[PDB]
């Protein structure tokens, strides 16, 4: 029992982190087979960032302008290209520690582990969700660009995030590993701000199901709701709409606990109305929305504590 924000073991990713330097700018790169992936803004100076012309900046670079360092060893760059907002540096050595991997672009609400890295050296690992407003609430300092987010379902690492920037509200924006930004964000210093964020309803429900599994029933009530009435109330608390897809996805947790999804929705409605009245749910005084239905099944017993 217990319930923790748990990250995937980071070792398969640690073996892929390198340092990339262009000019005076150093950040992190991901070394998979014979390619190093990093944010294209590594090629920018101070001035460049207001209105960078990346094509023009890049055409002026040779391979040997890119210094790649893997632990103690310099890797030799033998090619470069730009894909969307990532630079792909072809190097002369395949990474012998390359894991089984794939690139996946995630949807808002999905969770992943972040390996925070500085100078190509990993510092820490923590669990994050893609917010409805396409930001992440990370922990990142200057030098963290090129840090990656991932899941490891089985022995296969699914890379889903590369860190590019911190927005003015202190939350974080980045790309998939094909270099496409999550959200409306650009790798340019302009006025861009996170949209108003909402709570990830499907995840809160999953976590309520986790609390029941772990032996906790105080917040249930005798009521049900229609989906549309649930969504009319939810939206007033800045909760994301719940779709029929979300109801379907919660089906297994519904079976394990014997509580229908719209009955759990009725419980959530009442929690939003009443608060917790000095109680906690799985150690929290707030409703948690960074555990997915999949994450609850991964972590929780399939025997509920009745």
Ligand X SMILES: O=C(N[C@H]1CCSc2ccc(F)cc21)Nn1cnc2ccccc21
Binding site for Na ion (CB under 5 A): 221, 223, 263, 266
Span 130-169, contacts to ligand X by CB under 6 A: 140-142, 144-145, 164-166
Catalog residues that contact a copy of itself under the rule CB under 8 A: 1-12, 14-15, 115-116, 118, 122-126, 128, 137-141, 166, 170-172, 214-215, 280, 283-286, 299-302
Active-site residue, selected from the candidate residues 22, 44, 128, 145: 145
What is the spatial distance between Cα 230 and Cα 152, in angstroms, rounded to a whole number?
Answer: 34
CB of 46 to ligand X, least distance (A): 7
In terms of Cα–Cα distance, which of 104, 152, 100, 165 is closest to 125? 152
In this structure, the number of other CB atoms found within 10 A of the CB of residue 81 comes to 11
Q: What is the maximal distance between C-alpha atoms in the chain?
A: 69
Angle ∠(270,276,281) on CA atoms, nearest 5: 105
50: Cβ–Cβ under 8 A, 6 or more apart, which residues?
Answer: 188, 189, 190
189 touching ligand X, by CB under 6 A: yes
Which of a copy of itself, Na ion, ligand X, none does residue 223 bind to, with CB < 5 to 8 Å depending on kind? Na ion
Which of Na ion, ligand X, a copy of itself, none does residue 187 bind to, with CB < 5 to 8 Å depending on kind? ligand X
CB of 221 to ligand X, least distance (A): 29
Which of Na ion, a copy of itself, ligand X, none does residue 189 bind to, with CB < 5 to 8 Å depending on kind? ligand X
Give 59 or 141: the residue with its C-beta nearer to ligand X.
141
Would you call 41 a catalytic residue per the annotation?
A: yes
The residue sitting closest to Na ion, measured at its beta carbon, is 266
Span 57-96, contacts to ligand X by CB under 6 A: none
Which of a copy of itself, Na ion, ligand X, none does residue 188 bind to, with CB < 5 to 8 Å depending on kind? ligand X
In terms of Cα–Cα distance, which of 177, 150, 142, 186 is closest to 54? 186
In terms of Cα–Cα distance, which of 147, 131, 113, 132 is closest to 7? 113
6 touching ligand X, by CB under 6 A: no
Would you call 172 a catalytic residue per the annotation?
A: no
Listed as own residue / partner, the contacts of 163-166 with beta carbons closer than 8 Å and 24 or more positions apart are 163/39, 163/114, 163/138, 164/39, 164/41, 164/85, 166/140
Active-site residue, selected from the candidate residues 41, 163, 164, 246: 41
Active site residues: 41, 145
């Amino acid at each position: 029992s217990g319930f923790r924000k748990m990250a995937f073991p980071s070792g398969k990713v640690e073996g892929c982190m390198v340092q990339v330097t262009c000019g005076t700018t150093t950040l992190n790169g991901l070394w998979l087979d014979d390619v190093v992936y990093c944010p294209r803004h590594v090629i920018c100076t101070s001035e460049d960032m207001l209105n960078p012309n990346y094509e023009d900046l890049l055409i002026r670079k040779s391979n040997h302008n890119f210094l790649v360092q893997a632990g103690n060893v310099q890797l030799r760059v033998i090619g470069h290209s730009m894909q969307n907002c990532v630079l792909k540096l072809k190097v002369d050595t395949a990474n012998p520690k390359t894991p089984k991997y794939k690139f996946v672009r995630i949807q808002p609400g999905q969770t992943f582990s972040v390996l925070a890295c500085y100078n190509g050296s990993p510092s820490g690992v923590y669990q994050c969700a893609m917010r409805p407003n396409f930001t992440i609430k990370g922990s990142f300092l200057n030098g963290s660009c090129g840090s990656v987010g991932f899941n490891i379902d089985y022995d296969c690492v699914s890379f889903c995030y590369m860190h590019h920037m911190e927005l003015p509200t202190g939350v974080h924006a980045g790309t998939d590993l094909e270099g496409n930004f999550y959200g409306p964000f650009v790798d340019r210093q302009t006025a861009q701000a996170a949209g108003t964020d909402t709570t990830i309803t499907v995840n809160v429900l999953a976590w309520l199901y986790a609390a029941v599994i772990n032996g906790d029933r105080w917040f249930l009530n005798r009521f049900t709701t229609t989906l549309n009435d649930f969504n009319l109330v939810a939206m007033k608390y800045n909760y994301e709409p719940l779709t029929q897809d979300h109801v379907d996805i919660l089906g297994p947790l519904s079976a394990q606990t014997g509580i229908a999804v719209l009955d759990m929705c009725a419980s959530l409605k009442e929690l939003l109305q009443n608060g917790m009245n000095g109680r906690t749910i799985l150690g929290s005084a707030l409703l948690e929305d960074e555990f997915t239905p999949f994450d609850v099944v991964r972590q929780c017993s399939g025997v509920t504590f009745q």
